[PDB]
Amino acid sequence: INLQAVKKKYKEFIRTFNEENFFYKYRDTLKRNYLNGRYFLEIEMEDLVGFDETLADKLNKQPTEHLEIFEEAAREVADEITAPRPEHEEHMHDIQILLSSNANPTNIRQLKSDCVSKLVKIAGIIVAASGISAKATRMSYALPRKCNPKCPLDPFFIMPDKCKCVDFQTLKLQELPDFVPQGEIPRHLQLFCDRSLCERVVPGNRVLIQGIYSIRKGVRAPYMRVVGITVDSEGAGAISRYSNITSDEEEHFRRMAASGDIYERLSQSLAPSIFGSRDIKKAITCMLFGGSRKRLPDGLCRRGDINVLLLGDPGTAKSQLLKFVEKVPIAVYTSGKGGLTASVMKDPQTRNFVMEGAMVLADGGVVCIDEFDKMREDDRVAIHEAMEQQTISIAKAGITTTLNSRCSVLAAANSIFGRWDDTKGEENIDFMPTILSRFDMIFIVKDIHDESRDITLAKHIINVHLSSNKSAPSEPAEGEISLSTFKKYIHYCRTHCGPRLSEAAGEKLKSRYVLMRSGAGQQEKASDKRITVRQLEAVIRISESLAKIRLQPFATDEHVNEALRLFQVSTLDAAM
Amino acid sequence: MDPSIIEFIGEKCMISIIPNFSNEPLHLIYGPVGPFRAGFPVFVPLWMATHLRKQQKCRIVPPEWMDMDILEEIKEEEKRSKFFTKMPCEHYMVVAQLVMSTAPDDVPRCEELRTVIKDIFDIRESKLRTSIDAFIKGEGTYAKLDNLTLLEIHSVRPILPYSLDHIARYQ
Amino acid sequence: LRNDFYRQLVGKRILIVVNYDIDAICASRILQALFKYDHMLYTVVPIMGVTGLKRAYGEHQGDVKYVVLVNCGGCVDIVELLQPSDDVTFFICDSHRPLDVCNIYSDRQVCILGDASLEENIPAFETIFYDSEGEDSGAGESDQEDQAPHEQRILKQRARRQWESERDRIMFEYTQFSYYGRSAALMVFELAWKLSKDNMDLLWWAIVGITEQLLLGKIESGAYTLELEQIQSHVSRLTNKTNDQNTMSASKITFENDLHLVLYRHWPVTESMRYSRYSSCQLKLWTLRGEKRLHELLLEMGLPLVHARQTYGAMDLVLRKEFFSMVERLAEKYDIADIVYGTFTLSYGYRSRYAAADYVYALLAIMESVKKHKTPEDCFLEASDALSRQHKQLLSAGIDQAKLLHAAVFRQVQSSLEARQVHSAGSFFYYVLQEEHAFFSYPYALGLLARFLLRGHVATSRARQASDLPLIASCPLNASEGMCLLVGIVPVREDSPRNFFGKAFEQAAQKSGVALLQDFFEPAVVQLRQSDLTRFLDSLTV
Numbered sequence A: 001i002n003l004q005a006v007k008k009k010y011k012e013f014i015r016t017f018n019e020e021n022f023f024y025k026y027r028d029t030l031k032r033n034y035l036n037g038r039y040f041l042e043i044e045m046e047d048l049v050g051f052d053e054t055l056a057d058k059l060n061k062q063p064t065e066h067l068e069i070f071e072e073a074a075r076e077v078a079d080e081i082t083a084p085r086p087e088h089e090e091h092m093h094d095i096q097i098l099l100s101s102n103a104n105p106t107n108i109r110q111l112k113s114d115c116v117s118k119l120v121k122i123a124g125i126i127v128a129a130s131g132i133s134a135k136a137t138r139m140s141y142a143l144p145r146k147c148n149p150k151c152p153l154d155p156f157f158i159m160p161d162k163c164k165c166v167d168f169q170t171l172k173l174q175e176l177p178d179f180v181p182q183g184e185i186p187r188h189l190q191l192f193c194d195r196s197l198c199e200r201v202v203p204g205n206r207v208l209i210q211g212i213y214s215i216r217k218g219v220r221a222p223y224m225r226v227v228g229i230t231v232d233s234e235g236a237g238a239i240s241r242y243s244n245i246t247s248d249e250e251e252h253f254r255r256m257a258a259s260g261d262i263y264e265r266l267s268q269s270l271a272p273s274i275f276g277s278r279d280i281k282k283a284i285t286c287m288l289f290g291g292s293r294k295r296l297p298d299g300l301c302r303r304g305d306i307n308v309l310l311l312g313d314p315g316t317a318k319s320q321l322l323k324f325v326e327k328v329p330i331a332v333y334t335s336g337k338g339g340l341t342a343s344v345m346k347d348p349q350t351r352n353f354v355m356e357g358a359m360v361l362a363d364g365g366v367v368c369i370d371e372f373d374k375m376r377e378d379d380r381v382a383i384h385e386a387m388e389q390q391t392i393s394i395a396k397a398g399i400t401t402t403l404n405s406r407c408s409v410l411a412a413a414n415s416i417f418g419r420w421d422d423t424k425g426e427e428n429i430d431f432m433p434t435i436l437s438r439f440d441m442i443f444i445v446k447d448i449h450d451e452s453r454d455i456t457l458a459k460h461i462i463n464v465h466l467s468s469n470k471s472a473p474s475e476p477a478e479g480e481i482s483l484s485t486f487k488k489y490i491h492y493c494r495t496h497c498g499p500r501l502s503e504a505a506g507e508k509l510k511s512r513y514v515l516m517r518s519g520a521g522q523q524e525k526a527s528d529k530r531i532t533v534r535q536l537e538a539v540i541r542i543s544e545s546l547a548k549i550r551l552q553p554f555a556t557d558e559h560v561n562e563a564l565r566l567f568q569v570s571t572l573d574a575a576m
Numbered sequence B: 001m002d003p004s005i006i007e008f009i010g011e012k013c014m015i016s017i018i019p020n021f022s023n024e025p026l027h028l029i030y031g032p033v034g035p036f037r038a039g040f041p042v043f044v045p046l047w048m049a050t051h052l053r054k055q056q057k058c059r060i061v062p063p064e065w066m067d068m069d070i071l072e073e074i075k076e077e078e079k080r081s082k083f084f085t086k087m088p089c090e091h092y093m094v095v096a097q098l099v100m101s102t103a104p105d106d107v108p109r110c111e112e113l114r115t116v117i118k119d120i121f122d123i124r125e126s127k128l129r130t131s132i133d134a135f136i137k138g139e140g141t142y143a144k145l146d147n148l149t150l151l152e153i154h155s156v157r158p159i160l161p162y163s164l165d166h167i168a169r170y171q
Numbered sequence C: 001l002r003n004d005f006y007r008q009l010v011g012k013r014i015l016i017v018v019n020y021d022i023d024a025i026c027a028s029r030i031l032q033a034l035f036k037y038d039h040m041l042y043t044v045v046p047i048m049g050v051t052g053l054k055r056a057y058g059e060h061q062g063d064v065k066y067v068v069l070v071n072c073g074g075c076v077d078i079v080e081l082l083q084p085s086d087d088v089t090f091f092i093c094d095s096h097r098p099l100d101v102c103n104i105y106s107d108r109q110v111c112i113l114g115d116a117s118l119e120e121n122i123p124a125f126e127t128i129f130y131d132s133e134g135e136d137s138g139a140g141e142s143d144q145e146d147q148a149p150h151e152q153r154i155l156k157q158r159a160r161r162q163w164e165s166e167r168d169r170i171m172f173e174y175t176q177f178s179y180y181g182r183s184a185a186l187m188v189f190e191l192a193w194k195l196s197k198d199n200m201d202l203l204w205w206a207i208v209g210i211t212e213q214l215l216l217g218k219i220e221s222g223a224y225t226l227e228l229e230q231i232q233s234h235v236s237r238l239t240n241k242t243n244d245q246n247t248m249s250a251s252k253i254t255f256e257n258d259l260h261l262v263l264y265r266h267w268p269v270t271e272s273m274r275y276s277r278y279s280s281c282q283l284k285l286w287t288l289r290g291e292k293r294l295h296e297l298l299l300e301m302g303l304p305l306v307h308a309r310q311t312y313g314a315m316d317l318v319l320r321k322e323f324f325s326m327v328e329r330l331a332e333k334y335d336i337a338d339i340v341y342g343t344f345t346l347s348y349g350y351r352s353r354y355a356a357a358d359y360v361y362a363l364l365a366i367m368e369s370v371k372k373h374k375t376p377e378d379c380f381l382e383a384s385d386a387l388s389r390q391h392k393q394l395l396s397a398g399i400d401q402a403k404l405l406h407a408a409v410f411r412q413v414q415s416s417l418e419a420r421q422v423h424s425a426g427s428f429f430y431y432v433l434q435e436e437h438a439f440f441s442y443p444y445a446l447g448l449l450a451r452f453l454l455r456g457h458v459a460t461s462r463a464r465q466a467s468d469l470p471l472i473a474s475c476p477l478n479a480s481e482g483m484c485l486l487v488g489i490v491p492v493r494e495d496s497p498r499n500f501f502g503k504a505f506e507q508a509a510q511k512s513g514v515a516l517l518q519d520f521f522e523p524a525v526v527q528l529r530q531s532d533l534t535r536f537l538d539s540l541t542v
């Protein structure tokens, strides 16, 4: 029945939730949502078993009705508490509910006819979703014949001064990469969202989802919506924009910050299976942290982030490292074969020139690629541009919407003949220097021989490659632990501090770069044959990154001797 | 202002219980206490029923304003109470907590009372904000206590006035 | 019996609790609460080993009067161990009963809790210190030259004849077998029950105390089908409410006939039918076939497969209510008989309804032998700070940790078995192990290791010739630079016939003897050097 539910059960349910400690309610939560305009509420799905043993097993079967008996109970229990006296219910207001659980996730490949008009739980991934048009509830579907001398046959004028308005967003879902796409490609699905959950999910994230598989019109169509979404914890599966982090988390964080044995701890963090290569690694982690995007009263929106390089003989674990940098806030990865054009296609509906837009998708994330080498030049010029001004322009048809995106970039490579070029002269790149110039890092890889190193890289790998070893003994090391922390920690540290230099750093850095350029020019003159602003404006970013690390705003050049001794590697690499 | 400071005020209030003993190794403490003999009521303050009930010595029963019916009609009196309502002992928000904490091993109806007392609590509290949405012109000679209680008013005390004086000085 | 002595207990004391146990914490937290009742301050103690005990008394080397130790006693003639003991009040209450009587007599500084249907050692002292040979008691203890009020020296002959002919029973004591006996704090419950204490949570704590070693396979209950009268008679007869029990907090606790398969409640099924021994070994699942016979039983129950990989709590209703309503009757006929046992359950409130033993399998998993060097005692202080109703964020972590260990257990068993690491090596069976785990460092988990291999191999590859033979195992500690731990364990299905190995390993110690230790009050354990066992094993065969 419609009323025996609202008559007592839902209406007293919220009223009855009782554990001493005088918290265990959804009443106070409802009011402290109400006060601040939120208009929502969350529940589990296995608390009702703590109230009864039937209603839940009715919630699954006829959800669409129960989830409005809830709304009626919600407002009729909440407007009593709106009343300070009968004189401050200015007017009532509508709410939306959320429910959650921890039961079990599913996969798209089992969404079939039996799992229809029924609650579920899944786990997928996102690509993109629509804009925000509209939808409403009532105003003053079939609109029948009668009129209300004659007035004939359906003369109905909508009075939209007297209509209403809620939201509408149409979310999307693709599967995960480990549920038999092997002999296939991945399918996907489109969705639906209602009132307060637009701008709750940007594309490119891992989801938990609570939804329902229902139709619109025997070949008729699918779709799904949210029935109280939540999110993922792949380490920190969804910790990408919002904050349910608590003072405990800030406390643990900043207590880690002042701990002055964190950076040399973090130079051993990425590889619980690889040996060595530490000076290569001291600034693969700073690349995430980023420096400062300082605009000024003139134009100079100077380059914020940093950029990476590496090229070397195979056999030194390039691929795993870059896959790991993808793994550990948000990022994507391709390598070669992909663009120079952007996406001016045309929805066959309405025949216009829309802009679908994927350096877009790293506007706070980053990007990593291998093979700038083995992808030719028809698609390098748009990326020549993007990574120096970030004002990604468009001028194709009658649109000049030079949008922008702030992304960094990481580059692997492969040179011909190994260190054949790297011993002799000008075959470092085969193509051009202005994407070798326009970067920051300059880190070459070699695989030189020595018997001690040989035997050690022998047994070091065996204990790694023996029987999925690292259950016990990885975290028992000092502090080389928990990428999940690194995700949430970065998404703090980048989004708070506004650091910049001291006085004493400036003169020392100027003199040092002066000596660097002078040494380059002397190599020009000491060989009778043949230094940007970019090098200064990049190495400053490592000071930026370090001060980002320890959370000190102002940093020193003695703090940055490490950074300039990292750049020393670049200098003595391109020594010739 | 604290959760317990006003229990060094409020917990001194009186109830009436039945112990299970004869007179103790000492019979009576020189003071308003009455004599100790099992099987009959005795009137006490509240810094012992805590100490007594969990010392597994006796029973305990409440005053009369703890019921359902009186605290089901006081609310509908309160609904039209444009100012204030009935006040059973004026610090009754704390005796309830210190009773319903331990006592419910034997007390009757130990939840629905919580329901109604919060149902009065919230309505009067939200009342005690709407004084502020009409309090104009620095009217620091005109305000409300008439049948107010104390355990609510510390929930405002350090917020408004401490700044209100040095702010609304201008009028 | 201390309805008379307890009225001595007001002044200062020390409450010791010897080496870690669930009997320990259960029997001791209750006494903590008791002694904060009559306004005394007191002391709870961790023991890591008997050296920790001697230094503890060294650390408590005062004249503290009402000193207590519980669940110990068989270490020394404790008068000899304990010099400053002059008239100090000692208390034992230990269930490891087979103790010498040098500790019992000298009725000043001990408390003889001698009460049993076994009058087996009555003259047991009348010849050891009372008589002697090769030394005025007027006995062999005194002179033996025809001076003691067939030949002049047959005095000694009759003396040693009686001595040794009844060492037939002295060698029966402490030199054939060991065990435990009775409860840890059920006696203490009935003690306190005279003082009008209706603490339902105390009943739960003692239920935890019993259901540890109610494990009729690990350690015997005996009283069990008698405590289905006794404990109910404690609790059921005294009902404070015949009509008012539909209440939120701590509803008056109950009893039901349920099972001892692991963690039926909080996990899915088809992994939790997999980690116990009695359900697994009798269905043989580490081989492929066992999944098939399991599956053909799931047919007869006709549960869904998809459901059998959902948490039991997470299932829909009717199956999850009818589950045990089915399983008890159509499992008796398919190789498994004896998982159903007698236990309890209750909820605090609305969250979920904890299982009366499901703490102990988190407690055993709170033994975190971590390299921080502090954590055993912190594990104790966490454990006794866990069993309440209050601290509950941590019990879930305990359950998680427990299950991941229990599903790491099997991971080694398949690895070890089908390589045939089951070394016979003569009269008994023998196992060896190579490097360290944080899982199975300490020996509780090690006995748990042994007690899956054992049933598996010895039940399934043999005739009935050798199905009754005992067990040993290595266990290395890369912790302490190489010591090569060992534990002794019994043959199959002989409940009362328990360990030979109260001392039996000491045979080889008697022959050669190499750096052996017995630091634990636990007898069923030893500790060695890193690799000095091989010749000691050649000795330790017979």
Ligand SMILES: Nc1ncnc2c1ncn2[C@@H]1O[C@H](COP(=O)(O)OP(=O)(O)OP(=O)(O)O)[C@@H](O)[C@H]1O
Pocket (backbone or CB within 6 Å): A273, A274, A275, A312, A313, A314, A315, A316, A317, A318, A319, A320, A413, A414, A461
């Ligand atoms: N220094 C190292 N220590 C341990 N393992 C290594 C190391 N280098 C490589 N490996 C092993 O080899 C693999 C890494 O090879 P990788 O894919 O980086 O070669 P590559 O850089 O892709 O070669 P190319 O650049 O020619 O494609 C890893 O899977 C890892 O197991």
